[PDB]
Design a protein around this ligand. Structure first.
Ligand SMILES: C[C@]12CCC(=O)C[C@@H]1CC[C@@H]1[C@@H]2CC[C@]2(C)[C@@H](O)CC[C@@H]12
Lengths: 228, 58, 338, 268
């Protein structure tokens, strides 16, 4: 090192200092994948020309939301760079009784991939209001859509909202069970499925994401510690 | 529609012009490749190891 | 009608294949056998470039064979010296994820692209000030994959809109769009001559493209998998492709047919990157089996291995002077072999 | 306090068992140390926890070797009193190291948010300064009470044992609390589904490397020390074998790293 190439050394040292400073922010930021489709509650959840981003503060822990607006039919192309994500958010309509089997097919497709078979999936439910006036109205009966309604009993582990007729909770647990049936087949590794039931205009969402991510991180760390 | 018809016509013209491409035996191309590999073999410090003298990475 | 067009566009492909069979008289594994094999190669790395924040995806080498680029998921562009293992400039950018690196031949313009559908070019040598944006470029509804500079005023690129397009720095307007591909294009390389360039897509096909007229010159054959990377021979008459089929292929531009099948029974992992050297005897190709691999070109014989990376590789390149080989891998590590 | 260590009927099968256990522990621990030294380039063994394991194993190994040498040394001779303080310092360093490991486990389990903080300086400081402070405060006043007539260890009938039993009790109480909390968490997790299998595995895994087996010493020193010394010796001297076996042959990440390194070595 002659007496010319020493300013570059201190410049590089400063660059490493800036990178180490950035580390303290990058390592403490949690990022999520927010999937979904149209006619869902994307506008409501996102309100709290390529890749979009929204920032929100929850319990003094930074969180990152990622949603795309230029995704074609193909999905496996850019999914390669999604392996480092922590949890995956899935949004379903659950109000219109049609456009539901496609959601299950999408759930199976994401749940059965090979590269990302280490990320858990966070379920969600939207448009709780629209479901209410549809079940009590004898126009769009769910029996004609799914013919297994005649064979269904409300599970014992139930937390019904007060003032709800048995049909409403029956339909809610119908959706929950039909969403959980696919998940219990595969998996058995480091990822599970976490059904959730939250309204659209509500603030308890952050608590739900907090508890889900805390449980996932705790399970992952305990598994890494050989205890399980 | 008209856009699909135009795209089909463009691809048909492309395929028609694909036939009017000069063709020569791959043996001649292989000969040129071998000649280039053999002639440009001394001036490459990968296949032939170089002494540490004329090596800035040493 | 569409059925009539589909029926009519069969015999011409049939006679193209017949001409391919007629022209194919011999193969490299049948005429190149008297040459001396390269033998064992003990390439041991001396410098290990660390400091990247997260997994990297691309790299390039400058004209001076001194400055190299690399980008990561964190959204930083850094240019190093590769001699005193030091960095000259760190370039943050708006798009938090990037997918492309490129260095201009004059060593002034660096192009960064990703899935943001915006092409950003940075003027490293400013008149008075630090690094600043030069001219944003957009117009593609798909995700950009890769781009390589051709001159200082124009640049070609590949996007997620199953089509290719070139842009002029002045007026920033797309002149002639390159259309004809069905699958998503995810690989593109240039040629020493500024007249022709090739690209590969997920349709297991490649097409030769012309810069000036924007008309597809030649079409390649099947690859049985999605093409990820492509490289061009220095002579300008051959190119090598890669895919997830674990079979690298070397198709000559003049021949436009499959000649070499880099098939090994042990390997099952796909190929990530491919780059040649000046001599053309050797060829290094990154692998998804958690390490790098070399491959002789004229001979289908293994010539040692290049292992040492914790994670799978993502990029690989060879300097212009053909002295060092640098490989990038997902473990946030940059390794350069002398 | 009356020692009541070995009067008659328990003197035999004590020193020989100690020798056998120490030999097994030293072999296993030197194997663990050489394995850690070899397996340091890859990313799997790059976290803070493995550094804690390495330094803890080194401290235990050096303390055990020093004790083995201390067994064969004449009393009333200067090197004996020179190395007694080293013996005590090394044992206290091991105690503080498993205390730090327990604190790290507590911060990792119940406080998952903030585990990755790069606290290397604080861990080393609190692991290698507390024994030094205890040693200097002991040598400030306790000098004559550092060599007895029986063996090279310090006298236990002068009140100078304060530097060991109190830290032992503190570490044991903290360990009991942490283990109870972790066992409750594990039982809650496992209640959502083999009932008494994962809990037993966790207890056995956390027993030797963290140090919850020192409770028997209190009973051994005072109160019906007839049958509770065989278990003390067997479960304390053979700490090496236990830690080596468990956290070097059952750790999932260690095996994968070793296989990868073997593949790399065989490639060239
Ligand atoms: C308490 C001592 C001596 C004091 C000390 O530093 C700890 C050490 C622990 C092992 C003990 C040893 C005293 C002699 C004992 C009790 C032998 O009987 C077998 C184990 C030995």
């Amino acid at each position: 090192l002659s007496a010319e190439d020493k300013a570059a050394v201190e410049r590089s040292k400063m660059i490493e200092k800036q990178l180490q400073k950035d580390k303290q922010v990058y390592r403490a930021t949690h990022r999520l994948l927010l999937l979904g489709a149209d006619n869902s509650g994307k506008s409501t959840i996102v309100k709290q020309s390529g890749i979009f981003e929204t920032k929100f503060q929850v319990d003094k822990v930074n969180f990152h939301m990622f949603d795309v607006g230029a995704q074609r039919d193909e999905r496996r192309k850019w999914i390669q760079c999604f392996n480092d994500v922590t949890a995956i958010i899935f949004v379903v309509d659950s109000s219109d009784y049609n456009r539901l089997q496609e959601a299950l097919n999408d759930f199976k497709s994401i749940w059965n991939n090979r590269w990302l078979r280490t990320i858990s999936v966070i379920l969600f439910l939207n448009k709780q209001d629209l479901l209410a006036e549809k079940v009590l109205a004898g126009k769009s009966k769910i029996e004609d859509y799914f013919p297994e309604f005649a064979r269904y009993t409300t599970p014992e582990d139930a937390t019904p909202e007060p003032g709800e007729d048995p049909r409403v909770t029956r339909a809610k647990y119908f959706i929950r069970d039909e969403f959980l049936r696919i998940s219990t087949a595969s998996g058995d590794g480091r990822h599970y499925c976490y059904p959730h039931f939250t309204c659209s205009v509500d603030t308890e969402n952050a608590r739900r994401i907090f508890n889900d991510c805390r449980d996932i991180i705790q399970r992952m760390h305990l598994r890494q510690y050989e205890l399980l | 529609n008209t856009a699909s018809i135009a795209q089909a016509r463009k691809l048909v013209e492309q395929l028609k012009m694909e036939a009017n491409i000069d063709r020569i035996k791959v043996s001649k191309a292989a000969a040129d490749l071998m000649a280039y590999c053999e002639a440009h073999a001394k001036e490459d410090p990968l296949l032939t190891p170089v002494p540490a003298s004329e090596n800035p990475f040493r | 009608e569409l059925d009539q067009l589909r029926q009519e566009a069969e015999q011409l492909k049939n006679q193209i294949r017949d001409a391919r069979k007629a022209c194919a008289d011999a193969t490299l594994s049948q005429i190149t056998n008297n040459i001396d094999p390269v033998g064992r190669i003990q390439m041991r790395t001396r410098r290990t470039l660390r400091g990247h924040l997260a997994k990297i995806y691309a790299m390039h080498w400058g004209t001076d064979s001194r400055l190299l680029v690399s980008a990561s998921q964190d959204g930083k562009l850094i240019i190093w010296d590769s001699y005193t293992t030091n960095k000259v400039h760190a370039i943050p950018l708006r798009s938090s994820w990037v997918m492309t690196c490129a260095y201009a031949p004059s060593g002034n313009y660096v192009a960064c692209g990703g899935l943001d559908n915006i092409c950003s070019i940075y003027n490293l040598k400013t008149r008075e000030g630090n690094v600043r944006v030069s001219r944003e470029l957009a117009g593609h509804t798909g995700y950009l994959s890769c781009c390589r500079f051709l001159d200082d005023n124009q640049i070609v690129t590949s996007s997620g809109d199953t089509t290719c397009a070139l842009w002029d720095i002045e007026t920033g307007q797309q002149t002639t769009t390159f259309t004809g591909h069905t699958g998503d294009v995810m690989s593109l390389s240039l040629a020493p001559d500024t007249r022709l360039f090739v690209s590969g897509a997920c349709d297991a096909s490649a097409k030769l493209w012309d810069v000036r007229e924007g008309m597809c010159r030649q079409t390649f054959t099947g690859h049985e998998s999605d093409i990820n990377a492509i490289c061009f021979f220095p002579n300008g008459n051959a190119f090598a492709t890669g895919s997830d089929d674990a079979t690298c292929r070397l198709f000559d531009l003049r021949a436009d047919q499959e000649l070499m099948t880099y098939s090994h029974d042990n390997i099952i992992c796909g190929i990530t990157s491919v780059s040649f050297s000046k001599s053309g005897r050797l060829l290094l190709a990154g692998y998804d089996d958690f390490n790098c691999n070399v491959w002789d070109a004229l001979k289908a014989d293994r010539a040692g291995v290049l292992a040492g990376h914790d994670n799978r590789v993502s990029c690989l390149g060879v300097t212009d002077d053909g002295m060092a080989v640098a490989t990038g891998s997902w473990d946030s590590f940059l390794k350069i072999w002398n | 306090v009356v020692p009541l260590e070995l009067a008659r009927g328990h003197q035999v099968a004590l020193s020989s068992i100690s020798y056998v256990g120490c030999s097994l522990s030293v072999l296993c621990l030197v194997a663990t140390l050489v394995t850690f030294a070899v397996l340091s380039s890859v990313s799997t063994i790059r976290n803070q926890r493995y550094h804690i394991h390495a330094n803890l194993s080194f401290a235990v190994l050096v303390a055990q070797v020093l004790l083995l040498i201390s067994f064969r040394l004449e009393p009333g001779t200067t090197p004996c009193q020179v190395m007694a303080v080293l013996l005590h310092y090394f044992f206290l360093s091991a105690f503080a190291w498993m205390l730090v490991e327990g604190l790290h486990l507590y911060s990792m389990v119940i406080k998952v948010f903030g585990s990755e903080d790069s606290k290397h300086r604080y861990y080393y400081g609190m692991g290698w300064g507390f024994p030094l402070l205890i040693c200097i405060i002991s040598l400030s006043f306790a000098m004559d009470s550092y060599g007895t007539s029986n063996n090279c260890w310090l006298s236990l009938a002068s009140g100078a044992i304060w530097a060991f039993v109190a830290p032992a009790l503190f570490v044991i109480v903290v360990n009991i609390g942490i283990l109870i909390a972790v066992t409750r968490v594990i039982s809650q997790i496992s209640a959502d589904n083999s009932a008494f299998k994962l809990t037993a595995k966790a207890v056995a895994v956390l027993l030797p490397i963290l140090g919850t087996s020192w409770v028997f010493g209190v009973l051994a020193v005072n109160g019906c020390a007839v049958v509770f010394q065989y278990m003390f010796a067997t479960l304390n001297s053979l700490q090496g074998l236990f830690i080596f076996l468990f956290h070097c042959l059952l750790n999932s990440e260690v095996r994968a790293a070793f296989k990868h390194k073997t593949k790399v070595w065989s490639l060239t």
